[PDB]
Write a protein that binds this ligand. Structure first.
Ligand SMILES: CCCCCCCC/C=C\CCCCCCCC(=O)O[C@@H](COC(=O)CCCCCCCCCCCCCCC)COP(=O)([O-])OCC[N+](C)(C)C
Ligand SMILES: CCCCCCCC/C=C\CCCCCCCC(=O)O[C@@H](COC(=O)CCCCCCCCCCCCCCC)COP(=O)([O-])OCC[N+](C)(C)C
Ligand SMILES: CCCCCCCC/C=C/CCCCCCCC(=O)OC[C@H](O)CO
Ligand SMILES: CCCCCCCC/C=C/CCCCCCCC(=O)OC[C@H](O)CO
Ligand SMILES: CCCCCCCC/C=C\CCCCCCCC(=O)OC[C@H](O)CO
Ligand SMILES: CCCCCCCC/C=C\CCCCCCCC(=O)OC[C@H](O)CO
Ligand SMILES: CCCCCCCCCCCCCCCC(=O)O
Ligand SMILES: CCCCCCCCCCCCCCCC(=O)O
Ligand SMILES: CCCCCCCCCCCCCCCC(=O)O
Ligand SMILES: CCCCCCCCCCCCCCCC(=O)O
Ligand SMILES: CCCCCCCCCCCCCCCC(=O)O
Ligand SMILES: CCCCCCCCCCCCCCCC(=O)O
Lengths: 141, 174, 133, 134, 134, 174, 174, 174
């Protein structure tokens, strides 16, 4: 009888199938490219800001800017709707997925259950500092 | 940077078209267990083929048809209209990219290339969603990932094509 | 009965969804009128209301007393309705344990999304050709 | 017996609602004061900022001073706890006399408050007009 | 064991709360550093931006640089997981043996923190005044 | 665009009034099972009528009255005060629209039309909510959807009327 | 508007002080069933008194003392430090309001009135929360609501006092 | 404020280094029940020691090794690479701070101090998370809190160092 396995560092992904994650990423790119296109059609929604706007919308944050055109607002509106459905579905039972032991009532979450989210965070801060040094040395030359 | 942008566009357009055409043609979308007429198989949009046994390399046509919503899903999946439409639009995008070198007078050609590539990628997303949804242990093979890389490249090329058109309309206005 | 393509709508009765849409229009029209009789014309009123409802926020916020009354009751309405949707959604997603959602369960939301992007591109071509001539 | 028009209040005791209202006023007045010490946070905007924070909306102003940000920060914390607690089981309170859709009858009261508010807004707008027309 | 005055903290272990605070400082310092390299992200606005993101409220300002947006993006992701986990798990604690309303005693601790914070804000405002008066 | 705006206003006002008056008069709000003296019936605000059986086309007046909140709901539903108020306000809106052609000096007439139409729509929403709430398998018929389309048209006409007034006060001030 | 603002301030300050002093003194905070030494009683901060029976009008001192957190709550409730502190601060606020008429040279007096009233209201909120929390069928009486109205008036007066000071520093600087 | 900033930097750098070195060296991270050969023990990164019984004051080298992810966690915890890396970076930060007093021409030295201190704090957070995660009734001791205070001080010193550099590049450009 093996000891019951603790859930993985990336257990926060577990509420959604891998294919939903992949499609969310393609949807994110599609939305961002279409927003840029419609906006150059008629600060501003270049591709980098389109990517930033979409990411903030999805993460339920918001950012500097909001589309002003009709076609930009259609894109924004459907992405907001998509986000509400997907995030609501993802967040429903999230803490249950983070604390589920499987064989290969109400407790507080423990640091071990969310450690992976912390490693991604500190990894990201490291990456940001690295990118900042590059973008510096490039512009220093 | 006009040269590099057009190089990225042209190579990219070819890459995306090639990847997507291979993907639609080849039969390594799904590795599931099944029967080529159960054994480990590799399937695609059109055919199922065995990897183990006496029949290893025998390959049988899929029966797409063994509720209106269910019927529509089966029909759309059977035709593979969305993967084929993605290939078509990539074809026309690349055509426009070529035409942008010759008849330079009309700037809108490279823009139309852009719109074709962006649309090709949207067609591709729909295709993937229909494919996965219709299949409801398995794993995806390299044909599947070629479709996915085609989507990424098409969207990058769409963005660069649109940039080309922008600096054209920003150079010639001033 | 198997859950439909648009099963994400299931936590609220059809009549709530219909009335949400009428409420959305009413709020947007009244916000426009109390503000006009960076500004709250009809299109921005529609955009403000939509963002509030979808929990996104907006460029702009009403400054008048009557604008803020309208905004404030719409915020209240939104908080109750969205909270009810997600509370009740959680219940529907766990009714026969920790099972991952499948792409088939949410495919309908993807169809609406890509539909919307198509419509946006179409509207953009029109709005272009109209302004070109 | 079907749950009342104001069943949306049911997840919290009456005394929490009363204290939320006093807390709302307290926070708004203190923000005004600290801000007339370091658009701007007059009393009306302080009231609007606090209301938006509580409703998880946000608005056309954020405090810039240290004391303003302390007030804002504790109100944001308060809001996160109280709204999280309120929203946990909300749909259960709306339908209490298996997993069913909410019906329009369960939320009708939220609609009556909404249309009432729109009526009130139009009335206030006519007044504010006729007053300024004189 | 009866639920404490600060029972609203109970869905997360003490060590998560502590690490959230260290993460908050780390994120804020790194965001400041990357930005003073690339209305601006000095340390106090970095702290304010991070706090608003975490509390799901927003902010005056948003990073514009690539490195600023990497930091912002990972903090948004962290926030979405941690807050969602808190409210998911909070819901579980609030319904563990019917629909009973919360009582003021169950949330009194959040009110004490709030009024404490308002007191502190007023004190800081008097200091920041008297310092700038002399 | 003064002509087109006033055309939209006038046609729209007539459309909204007509739709709402038909809806209040006719009996195809709800298709439920029941009895006209159980059988498939079609009901409205006032009457219930059978669709199948020997009594097909017999229609009985509804007994609205077969807790203060429940009593109020029954009373407000029974009177149909909110659908009738919506018809009345649409009537006065259209009256103001007509009067706007004569008394051009007084611009407030077209604005008052606007406010009548906006208010008519709010009355309509309340009516729908009272109707549906009081009814607590069924389906809504065309009378119901006429009320709903009246709401949409009234809100569009309200917005156009308000635009007309704004154009007037922005032309003559300058 | 200087006169009206100072009238509102002065009347308001008196109202708030009076309401709060009555509330702290009187014994209609809570209507619960109990014993004056079970029967329907009316209690306050200090005393419990019977409304029914042979002992109707007998009134006994509360035993506040029949975990550090529990002890602190009992102590703070027993003392009624927060309601009394609210009365004290309202007293000093009103004192400053009076002093603002005489020694006009120093503007900060009316500001200090403002801060006293704002603080009085914060003390009042804490008091209410301690009272309700320590009590854990019942209903609140008029003494309770006097405390609540005192909070509202104090906060209104604080806001007006601060406005007076702003008008003063905006008149005399220019 | 150049003097005060450099004082805060230098004292702070020493404080942070000292606290972190003590923490890595000492054995009061965790107060759990266990065995030094069960009894109440105090452990650290390296050793576990008993505080009640006949063996009070005996310390044994921890067996860090009594799934790839679990193995990695055990390895990273066993080495204490992240606490040691934090000490190293604090050492180099302080070194740069010293070097900033001599080579005033080269301003990047104090900036590099800043980046070392910021990075030291990130290494520290990772260490804490690895420590707590690997340990999965208990309590943390003073060695633990020294590591935590080191993180806070390092981040404050990083911010001050970066401010010094900014003041330098904003004084000499103008
Ligand atoms: C100002 C404006 C405000 C409103 C804006 C909001 C925007 C909303 C936008 C659009 C609304 C959504 C449209 C698509 C929904 C189809 C789903 C469907 O029927 O599923 C069926 C299964 O179907 C399948 O299995 C095949 C899926 C086909 C994908 C369709 C995408 C079309 C993209 C290209 C579109 C072309 C672009 C031009 C289009 C205009 C089953 O469902 P049913 O039970 O039969 O029902
Ligand atoms: C830049 C800064 C960033 C941070 C900002 C964040 C701000 C946070 C602010 C403040 C932190 C919270 C402080 C109050 C908490 C006390 C609760 C308590 O101990 O409860 C006990 C019960 O106690 C009771 O039953 C009595 C309640 C007394 C009310 C205290 C309010 C004081 C307001 C006036 C304050 C004066 C103003 C000056 C104060 C500084 C039990 O608890 P325990 O188990 O013993 O533990
Ligand atoms: C200026 C404002 C810009 C406007 C931007 C608008 C975008 C926002 C909303 C989109 C929701 C899409 C509607 C989805 C409705 C689907 C209904 C459906 O599928 O119904 C099935 C039926 O129940 C049989 O089973
Ligand atoms: C520029 C930035 C502005 C900064 C603005 C900051 C305000 C935001 C947060 C407040 C949370 C208050 C935290 C309250 C912690 C209480 C801990 C507690 O009660 O612990 C009990 C313990 O568990 C024994 O039982
Ligand atoms: C500052 C700008 C102004 C903004 C202003 C708009 C904000 C409105 C928000 C919420 C309204 C909710 C009120 C609902 C309360 C009604 C029910 C109630 O109070 O009690 C019922 C009854 O007493 C016992 O049965
Ligand atoms: C546009 C500006 C730039 C902003 C950019 C920042 C936003 C980052 C957000 C989330 C990161 C989450 C990624 C975590 C994925 C790691 C886990 C995974 O993918 O799989 C694990 C492994 O492959 C099998 O064990
Ligand atoms: C932008 C996203 C940055 C993510 C990079 C950090 C990932 C490293 C953390 C995972 C380590 C592990 O647990 O194996
Ligand atoms: C605010 C506007 C909310 C729109 C999103 C919900 C729309 C869904 C309507 C579907 C239906 O009527 O069945
Ligand atoms: C600003 C708040 C406006 C609220 C006013 C509307 C309340 C009327 C609705 C309740 C009627 C009822 O159901 O009894
Ligand atoms: C981002 C900053 C989050 C602040 C809210 C949580 C603070 C609570 C800490 C309590 C504790 O350490 O036990
Ligand atoms: C403006 C006024 C319109 C908003 C109020 C609508 C009240 C009608 C609803 C009647 C039932 C209410 C109840 O059950 O108490
Ligand atoms: C900069 C990079 C720092 C962030 C990465 C920290 C990784 C250490 C954690 C070790 C255990 C991870 C695992 O089990 O996969």
């Amino acid at each position: 009888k093996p000891q019951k396995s603790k859930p993985g560092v990336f257990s926060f992904l577990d509420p959604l199938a891998y294919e939903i994650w992949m499609c969310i990423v393609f949807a994110y790119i599609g939305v961002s490219v279409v927003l840029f296109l419609v906006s150059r059609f008629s600060n501003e929604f270049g591709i980098f800001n389109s990517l930033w706007f979409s990411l903030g919308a999805f993460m339920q944050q918001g950012c500097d800017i909001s589309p002003r055109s009709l076609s930009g607002r259609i894109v924004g509106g459907v992405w907001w709707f998509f986000t509400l459905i997907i995030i609501s579905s993802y967040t429903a039972n999230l803490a249950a997925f983070l604390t589920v032991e499987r064989m290969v009532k109400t407790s507080a979450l423990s640091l071990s259950n969310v450690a992976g989210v912390f490693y991604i965070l500190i990894g990201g801060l490291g990456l940001a500092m690295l990118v900042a040094l590059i973008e510096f040395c490039y512009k220093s030359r | 940077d006009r040269g590099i942008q057009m190089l990225i566009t042209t190579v990219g357009a070819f890459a995306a078209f090639s990847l997507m055409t291979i993907a639609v043609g080849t039969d390594y979308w799904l590795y599931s267990r099944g029967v080529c007429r159960e054994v480990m198989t590799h399937s695609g949009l059109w055919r199922t083929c065995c990897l183990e046994g006496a029949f290893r390399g025998v390959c049988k046509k899929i029966d797409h048809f063994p509720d209106t919503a269910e019927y529509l899903l089966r029909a759309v999946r059977a035709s593979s209209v969305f993967p084929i439409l993605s290939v078509t639009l990539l074809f026309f995008g690349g055509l426009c990219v070529a035409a942008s070198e010759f008849h330079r007078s009309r700037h809108s050609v490279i823009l139309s290339a852009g719109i074709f590539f962006v649309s090709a990628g949207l067609s591709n997303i729909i295709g993937i969603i229909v494919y996965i949804s219709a299949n409801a242990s398995y794993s995806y093979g390299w044909s599947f990932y070629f479709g996915a890389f085609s989507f990424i490249i098409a969207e990058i090329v769409g963005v660069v094509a649109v940039h080309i058109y922008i600096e054209k309309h920003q150079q010639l206005r001033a």
